[PDB]
């Protein structure tokens, strides 16, 4: 109950946050709330024809910390397939406890790994495409500005090399990553905005841009060529009706350049892009790439959570498979196989042994371990989406 | 700076939740601050191919209430086609002001209106779907809590008839719906989930069961006929893979039921629904309907906001149309025609006379009028949609 | 455009070619505030450039209504069919230069 | 201004066959005429989803010979694709000079080029398709005939081993190719017809017999192998609404002749024929093939004209990329890098040294060498196809 239509950390935390059934029926439930003792697992009923890139459970922690729960969980910034060598569902959290003591949260247990792991995810494959040039993370304008540094934060898990959001990047702890905007050159105009955004420009930072404000893209590289000499990057965010073949323009502006002897100056993309237009960007000559929307606002993936046992018996509905599991993977090719928890490694033909991946964060409670930093994360995620071509 | 990745009401009035670009730019502007008037609209660059149903401009004014701006915008609830009888850009809000009093809210501004307007036109999509049966909005569990309430206000501004979130519910000042979980079924079994549920079931409202638990709909349907009397709803939340024909299994259940002479007992379907979805499932007997995903994480508008005049003189850049402009409506067949604000009205052909539909919320800071309850905006909003079949 | 209004002669509309070096939009601005007696403005817009020429036609036409010169037709040529140039017209083209 | 609507050698060399706006330009132009000195390249802005067999350079020469202009070209039966390696537009013809001096006869250089080279490059395509088999060009029928020979020529030079045209035979030296139509046997019946044909077929040639007119292909054919004994080929046109499956029909035909003996009997076929179509028939049996409408009407390359240099400064409008370059080709793998005219060679990996296609065919108007015959054309068109599978 603040300013803005959202819910507050304390809302959050105090269940509010949530659909009513879920406090009405733990009341329903009564006395026997205390001897009701279930495991839940989330499942991804969502998206099954792609990987996927975890993220939020960062967040999951955040709010179950301090409940009688032990909670396993699969570490952010892993990638795999939804359903495993098989067809089995892979869980990617479990949680164990009196299911009245913590079950008003599914709600926002699901809310912080569904949408998250949809934007790592799209930056992941938007990282595949940008190689070995860098792309950053320009879109919370997108959406709610609640959540904008949740965004930023699986945007860099993702593979992204930098991001807009002032808070996402105190987040992330990195320097925010931005340059001048056409308004600048609306205001003052080219001539007077280039030179102010290149007088403003410090530290370990390079130089850009924006080019497309009045002129036609080739010609104001051309006339910023003979402008100025230090000058590391031209942007260019051609408004999509002036955008007939973006590719073209792009050989065009790169080769005017050369012809001049500016071969030096690099050319920087954004507005609309995708992994598809990143990469046939880059292919035309394209260095460094900005992306927003299609990240910031990338489809959820569906995840549920369902009791998979109740005071030690596996139990379930239909549509679910019941028991308490395990996500074994081979740590070689990294085949994974979904087993029954009494299952801790198994044989990987090829390789070797599948270990699991699911791991205690919560005991109790409490904290098993110190949780990484974004970085940290972002960092195994590279390593993990080299698998994936 | 709080517990979860988000940002607080104070974070985003101090102008922490925007990309950095916008405070070192206006920095870069220096001195020149004073002397910047300008007026930026805010135009659709997003879908096209669709009406949209304008949510979120209650966020915008409290967040810019109290600063030196005017403010002109288009009525929540409104439901128009982004670009006008004659194809150009319709505007839904104007900023009067200098630049640099406001430029680091343009991050904010659109987040506000971009997500929320989404959501408003799907739920609306599926209002015109549903129609006079009951929907409700059962979605936030797909996105991140912090959002939780906004996402029911347009939901329930966009047609939806209740919503299932605490908060959210309270924002819109209506009682939260919500029927008895799996959860409690796999728990306590059916035959005593159901009569927990019916004994709990208060108030002026409708007893709801929900049976694809365990059963097949089709007998778990007839079981309960011949076990209760006074029981309102049957709810389906049928798994996808038990979903060969979702509307032949709602026709056996319902021939079923009328056999026992129990025609009485309506039915309710939820999961994975549509405008498509719910529309189909109404024409094969369903009468209530629990949609989330579809709405909840509907695509958003891509909102843009450029200046579109410097010191009272028309200025924009590539891809956009200069000075302020008034956004015109036929009073009778609706038809909009964007002009320059030097016009308020115009005749229109069949029908009568075409008046401004911008108006102004904020002057010099101060509202200009009591803002809408959501209720009263869902009242504009269904008579709004009324005009789109 | 100088050269081309100078000799245009007899019974005969000027027409001047916008797209050679600015943005169509910005060009016809400029032609607007700096030439009176110009009948029309002929787009022949790259392809590469040609992200939407409907839009663009009419952001032209917009940007000239403001400045009080919707006098001025807008004539469009280049890989033009009577698919193109039926979508052109809505958009407010009023002369088409049609070849291959 | 002679009898048909048609520009002769006359009109077209006083530059009566272009648009006036040209020297209406260059009248308006004037005294600046003198120091207006140019540099225009010829580019494809046509389909670029193919390669080209670079055709009517001899008619390009022809007209510009004795101008005061410096001509560099790429020798036409040459074949590449439009774009280079990396997507540059590759320039196939360079004119130097006094841009009033020439600029009339943009209009007729493209047209030299345009139809021309579309005409060559489908004819090569065929030519693939036909194999070792032979294909004739008898296309000009459905083209004015005025241009009837340059027709015939690029067919030659695109792959065709003979042509039916009078004209276009004699430019390229050799004999007219030509078989008994159907009006012989309309006329005089087939009997009679097939042999005033063997009768009248004369010196190194073989007999022809057209046996679609009255019969069914396949009783056609075994009359004729019983009734004559010295015959070459049976040629089918058989109507289209009688062509159910022609690959059918010739199997049939060829199984018949060989029961009987006649084996020997080659079977030849035309009448609506593609690269595809003339493959399919090959495989079914058909050893030669009369091709026209399919070449003769091929749709044209669409070249531009661009001046791309002013005294000796590079300059172009937007679209288009300035300076004068040369085409530099793997001498190995045949890989195009379109280059600034300051680089003769290049090292090509994998093969060895690209060195220049563009070739001076005028100085100051004076050819710097003899033109290529025909013969001699085609002759390097074919090795030059046979980098393409
Ligand atoms: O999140 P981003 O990747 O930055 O892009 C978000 C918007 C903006 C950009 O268009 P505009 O520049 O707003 O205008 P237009 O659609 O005309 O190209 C792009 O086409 C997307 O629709
Ligand atoms: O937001 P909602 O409309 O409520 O639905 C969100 C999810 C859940 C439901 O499937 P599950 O019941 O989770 O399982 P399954 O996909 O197997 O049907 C539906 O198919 C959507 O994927
Ligand atoms: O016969 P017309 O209708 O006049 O047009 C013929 C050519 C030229 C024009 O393109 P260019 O201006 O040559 O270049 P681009 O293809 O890049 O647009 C058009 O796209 C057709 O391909
Ligand atoms: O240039 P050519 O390859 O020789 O073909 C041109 C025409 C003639 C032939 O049909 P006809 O024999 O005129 O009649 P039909 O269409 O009925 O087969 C073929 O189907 C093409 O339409």
Not at 81 to 88: C, E, Q, S, T, V
Not at 109 to 127: D, E, H, N, W, Y
Not at 130 to 145: E, K, L, N, T
Not at 220 to 234: G, S
């Amino acid at each position: 109950m603040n300013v803005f239509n959202t819910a507050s950390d304390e809302d959050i935390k105090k269940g509010l946050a949530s659909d009513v059934y879920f406090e009405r029926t733990i009341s329903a439930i009564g006395d026997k709330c205390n001897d009701l003792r279930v495991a839940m697992e989330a499942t991804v009923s969502g998206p099954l024809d792609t990987w996927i890139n975890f993220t939020g459970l960062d967040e999951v922690l955040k709010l179950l910390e301090g409940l009688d729960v032990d909670l396993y969980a699969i570490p952010e910034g892993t990638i795999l397939f939804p359903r495993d060598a098989n067809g089995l569902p892979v869980p990617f959290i479990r949680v164990e406890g009196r299911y009245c003591d913590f079950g008003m949260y599914e709600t926002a247990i699901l809310g912080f790994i569904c949408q998250a792991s949809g934007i790592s995810t799209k930056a992941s494959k938007v990282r595949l495409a940008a190689g070995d040039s860098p792309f950053f993370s320009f879109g919370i304008r997108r959406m709610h500005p609640a959540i904008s540094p949740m965004i930023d934060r699986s945007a860099y898990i993702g593979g992204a090399d930098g991001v807009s959001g002032i808070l996402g990047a105190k987040l992330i702890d990195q320097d925010p990553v931005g340059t001048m905007p056409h308004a600048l050159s609306i205001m003052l105009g080219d001539e007077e905005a280039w030179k102010l955004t290149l007088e403003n420009t410090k530290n370990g930072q390079k130089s850009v841009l924006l080019i497309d404000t009045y002129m036609d893209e080739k010609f104001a590289a051309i006339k910023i060529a003979e402008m100025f000499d230090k000058v590391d990057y031209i942007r260019l965010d051609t408004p999509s009706s002036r955008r007939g073949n973006f590719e073209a323009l792009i050989r065009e502006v790169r080769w005017e350049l050369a012809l001049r002897g500016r071969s030096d100056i690099k050319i920087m993309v954004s507005g609309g892009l995708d992994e598809n237009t990143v990469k046939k960007l880059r292919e035309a000559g394209a260095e460094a790439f900005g992306v927003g929307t299609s990240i910031s606002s990338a489809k959820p993936f569906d995840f549920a959570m369902d009791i998979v046992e109740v005071n030690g018996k596996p139990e379930t509905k239909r549509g679910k498979m019941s028991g308490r599991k395990n996500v074994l993977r081979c740590t070689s090719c990294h085949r994974i196989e979904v087993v029954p928890a009494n299952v801790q490694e198994k044989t990987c033909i090829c390789g070797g042994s599948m270990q699991n991946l699911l791991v205690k964060y919560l005991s109790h409670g409490k904290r098993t371990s110190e949780y990484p930093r974004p970085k940290e994360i972002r960092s195994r995620s590279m390593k993990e989406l080299e698998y994936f071509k």
